[PDB]
C-alpha cells in the first residue's frame, strides 16, 4: 500500500483522492497475492509479473483498465453497470458508485485467463 503513497497524494481532490484508496486497498485486500506497482505513473497489480488491472485518474472520472480482452468479456455488464468504456478502459464518474462486484469477476478472469502469461500485456 506504501507503493501508492506518492500517487494518492498527488491526487488533491480529498473525495477523489478517498475513492481511489478505497478501491486500490479493496483490491488489494480481496486479492492478496496480487502485487500493487506504480509502473508509469499507473497503479496496478501485478500477477507473478503479469498485467492483471489499473486504475488512473482524470478530472471527471476514474479509468478502469483490463486490457482489451477484460473489456471484451464483461462489456454487457460494463454497460448494465452504467459507466461509458473504449476498447480498452472503462470510466467511472466520482458521482456514480464502483461496481466492487463487478471490479471482482474481471480481477478474478484477468487472473485465470493470464495463468503463466509470457509477456507483461495481452498482445
Given at each position: 500500500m506504501e507503493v501508492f503513497a506518492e500517487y494518492l497524494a498527488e491526487i488533491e481532490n480529498p473525495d477523489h483522492r478517498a475513492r481511489t484508496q478505497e478501491v486500490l486497498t479493496w483490491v488489494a485486500e480481496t486479492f492478496p497475492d496480487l502485487k500493487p506497482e506504480i509502473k508509469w505513473n499507473?497503479?496496478?497489480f501485478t500477477n507473478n509479473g503479469t498485467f492483471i488491472i489499473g486504475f488512473s485518474?482524470?478530472?471527471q472520472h476514474m479509468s478502469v483498465s483490463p486490457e482489451v480482452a477484460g473489456i471484451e468479456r464483461f462489456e454487457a455488464d460494463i454497460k448494465e453497470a452504467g459507466y461509458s468504456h473504449t476498447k480498452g478502459i472503462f470510466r467511472i464518474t466520482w458521482a456514480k458508485?464502483?461496481?466492487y462486484d463487478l471490479?471482482?469477476?474481471?480481477?478474478?478472469?484477468?487472473?485465470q485467463d493470464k495463468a503463466n502469461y509470457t509477456s507483461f500485456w495481452r498482445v
Open positions: 499507473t497503479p496496478m485518474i482524470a478530472k458508485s464502483v461496481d471490479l471482482a469477476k474481471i480481477i478474478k478472469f484477468n487472473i
